[PDB]
C-alpha cells in the first residue's frame, strides 16, 4: 500500500481540451487511411474557437485539419456544441505492428480563428487495424501469432513502484527472447509502460483492476448489481485513459471474478465506446458471452480437464466444439514456477499447425521475490511468509521466466 | 446410398463433371437412384459418387437432392472433401494428427480440419484405415479422436471384403487370384484386396 506511483501538478487553461479520441480506419488493402479525431473542450463556448489536428511523420507534416466546435446533429435536441471531429486522409500510411512500430505524431491544438494558441495536447499514433474475422484475430489484415507473457509490475527492492529503467530492461529482454506481446496482469499499468510498448513495439492486453478470486462462488460480487458502479469505474476509466495507445490491441475485463451480469454490461459498454479493439475475459469458462476470444488459463494441448461448469478443454478440441467459431489465445499458460516449462514445445507445435490457435501469454515474466538482509547485511531473496505475513502462500509468488533482478531462468 | 459416378481416370479429375454436356448422363445416375431408394429408412445420407473431382454438375445435382428430399444430408468427397457440394466434411484417408498439404486438395489432420476458419460442418471420413494385407495399424488413434471430438463423427473403413477371384490349378485346387492373373493388362495387381475379411468372408 501507499502512494506507489507518480504525483504531479498540471496547469490547464480555463478554456481547455478536456478529452480527445484518435481512430484510424482503412480501405481493403490499407493503401489509404482516414485518421478521425474527436476533441472535447470545457470552458466558455465561442464562435472564434478552433481545433487543429496535425499529423507528423518526423519533422514532416503529412496531414492537417481545422474546424470550429460543434458536432453533427445527434438527436432531437441537436448535437454537441462543445465537441468537434476532425478527419484527415492519409495515403499509403506506414503501418504499426510489433514487428515495425511505425509511429506518427498527432498534435491537437485548441486555438482562436486567427492562430492564437490556447493550449496543445498530443500523442503518438500507430496506424493499425485490429479485428476478428472468420474466427481469426487480424492485425492489419494478417492473422497474429501471440508470443506473449504476463507481466506484473514488480521490483525486488522497490516493490510495486515502477521506473523507466526497469521497464526498458524488461521490454528489451522480452523482445530479445522473441516475445511480441504482453498482458497487464491484472490492472492498468504505469502510464509510461504503454508509451514504451508503442515505441519499441509490443502488443498489449490492457486489463481492468478487477479480481475477486477469493469470493465464493467467484462471481458473488460481479453478478451483484450493487457492485456494478465500482466495477464500471475500473473498466471505463481505464478505456478513457489508454484508448489512444496503438500498442493496446485488446481490452480485458479483469481476471478470476467468475462470470456475472456486470461483466456482460461492461463488455457491451466497451464494444459500444471503442469498436476498434476486441474485448476478452476468461472468467466463467473462458468462452462466455463476455469475451470475443476463447482465452483459457492453463488449458492443455491434447488433454481435456473436464471440470464441472468450467472445463478446460484441450485447446485443439475447444476450437471445434459445436457452434464455436472464435479464435483461441490463452491468457495464461506454461506456468514457469521454478524448474518448469516442460512441454512448452507442444504448445508451439499446435499454435503453428492450427490457424485459430493464435498463441497465449506465459505465466509469467518475473519472480515476485523481495530482498531481505541477514545479520551480516547480505541480501537474499524472500517469498511468502518471510516477513511474518500469515496466512501466506510461500513460493507461489515466484512463477517467472526471469529472477526478480531480471537474471534469466 | 451412392450414385454410380466415378471418373477417376480423367485429367483433370473433373473434366467431365464440369462439362454441361455430361450433366444429363450424370443427373440420371443421381435422380434415378433417389427415385428408387428414397423410401428406405436405412438410407440416411445421399452421395453424388466418388473421385470425379468437383464440377458444376455436382453443385447442380447436390441442389436437386436438397430440393427433392430434404430428409437426408448429401455428401461428396471430390475436389477437397469440403466443397459446396457436401453437407459433411468427408475426406478419404485424412490422418488424425498429421497434415498432408497437397496443392488444391490437401488432406488436413481431421482434428485441424474441423476448426479451419469459418468451418462448422461435421466430419465423417468416407474412407479411412486402408485395410490392405497386414494393416489397420494406428486404427486406435482414429477412435480416441472420434470419441474426444464431438464433430468427428466417425468414418467408413476401406474396405469390407478382398476383391480376389478364384482360379484352379491342374489338380482342380482353387486359389485366390488378383490383378493380372487372367492375362488382364495393364492391371494393378493386388490393389484390389483391401478388406477386413477374405473373399470367402473368413476374417483377417
Ligand atoms: Na495458429
Ligand atoms: Na503465482
Ligand atoms: Na465425435
Ligand atoms: Na483398391
Swiss-Prot record, chain A:
Residues the record lists as binding Mg(2+) 2: 392
Reported effect, residue 152 to D/F/L/N: Less stable to heat than wild-type. Causes significant destabilizations of the first transition state
GO molecular function, one term: identical protein binding
First-to-last residue of the parent protein present: 207 to 615 of 1024
Known outcome of mutating residue 396 to A: Decreases the stability of the loop 794-804
Name of this chain's protein: Beta-galactosidase
Organism: Escherichia coli (strain K12)
Gene Ontology annotations of biological process type: lactose catabolic process
Reported effect, residue 256 to H: Slowly inactivates galactosidase activity by reducing the binding of magnesium. It increases binding specificity
Amino acid at each position: 500500500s501507499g502512494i506507489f506511483r507518480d504525483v504531479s501538478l498540471l496547469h490547464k487553461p480555463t478554456t481547455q481540451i478536456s478529452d480527445f479520441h484518435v481512430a484510424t480506419r482503412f480501405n481493403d488493402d490499407f493503401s489509404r487511411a482516414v485518421l478521425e479525431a474527436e476533441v472535447q473542450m470545457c470552458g466558455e463556448l465561442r464562435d472564434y474557437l478552433r481545433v487543429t489536428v496535425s499529423l507528423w511523420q518526423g519533422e514532416t507534416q503529412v496531414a492537417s485539419g481545422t474546424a470550429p466546435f460543434g458536432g453533427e446533429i445527434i438527436d432531437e435536441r441537436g448535437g454537441y456544441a462543445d465537441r468537434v471531429t476532425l478527419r484527415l486522409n492519409v495515403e499509403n500510411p506506414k503501418l504499426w505492428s510489433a514487428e515495425i512500430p511505425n509511429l506518427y505524431r498527432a498534435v491537437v491544438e485548441l486555438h482562436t480563428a486567427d492562430g492564437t494558441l490556447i493550449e496543445a495536447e498530443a500523442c503518438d499514433v500507430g496506424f493499425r487495424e485490429v479485428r476478428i474475422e472468420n474466427g481469426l484475430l487480424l492485425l492489419n489484415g494478417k492473422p497474429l501469432l501471440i508470443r506473449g507473457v504476463n507481466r506484473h509490475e514488480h521490483h525486488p527492492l522497490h516493490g510495486q513502484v515502477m521506473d523507466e529503467q526497469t521497464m526498458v530492461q524488461d521490454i528489451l529482454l522480452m523482445k530479445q527472447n522473441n516475445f511480441n506481446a504482453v498482458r497487464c496482469s491484472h490492472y492498468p499499468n504505469h502510464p509510461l509502460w504503454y508509451t514504451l510498448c508503442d515505441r519499441y513495439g509490443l502488443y498489449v492486453v490492457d486489463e481492468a483492476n478487477i479480481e475477486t478470486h477469493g469470493m465464493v462462488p467467484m462471481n458473488r460480487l460481479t453478478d451483484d448489481p450493487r457492485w456494478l458502479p465500482a466495477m464500471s469505474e475500473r473498466v471505463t476509466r481505464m478505456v478513457q485513459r489508454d484508448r489512444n495507445h496503438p500498442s493496446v490491441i485488446i481490452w480485458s475485463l479483469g481476471t478470476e471474478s467468475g462470470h456475472g451480469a456486470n461483466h456482460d454490461a461492461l463488455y457491451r459498454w466497451i464494444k459500444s465506446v471503442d469498436p476498434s479493439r476486441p474485448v476478452q475475459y476468461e472468467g466463467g469458462g473462458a468462452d462466455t458471452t463476455a469475451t470475443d476470444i476463447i482465452c483459457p488459463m492453463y488449458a492443455r494441448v491434447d488433454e481435456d480437464q473436464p471440470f464441472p461448469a468450467v472445463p478446460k478443454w484441450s485447446i485443439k478440441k475447444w476450437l471445434s466444439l459445436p457452434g464455436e467459431t472464435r479464435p483461441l489465445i490463452l491468457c495464461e499458460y506454461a506456468h514457469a514456477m521454478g524448474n518448469s516449462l516442460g512441454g512448452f514445445a507442444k504448445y508451439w507445435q499446435a499454435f503453428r499447425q492450427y490457424p485459430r490457435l493464435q498463441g497465449g501469454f506465459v505465466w509469467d515474466w518475473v519472480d515476485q521475490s523481495l530482498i531481505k538482509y541477514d545479520e551480516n547485511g547480505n541480501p537474499w531473496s524472500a517469498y511468502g511468509g518471510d516477513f511474518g505475513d500469515t496466512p501466506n502462500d510461500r513460493q507461489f509468488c515466484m512463477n517467472g521466466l526471469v529472477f526478480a533482478d531480471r537474471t534469466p531462468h
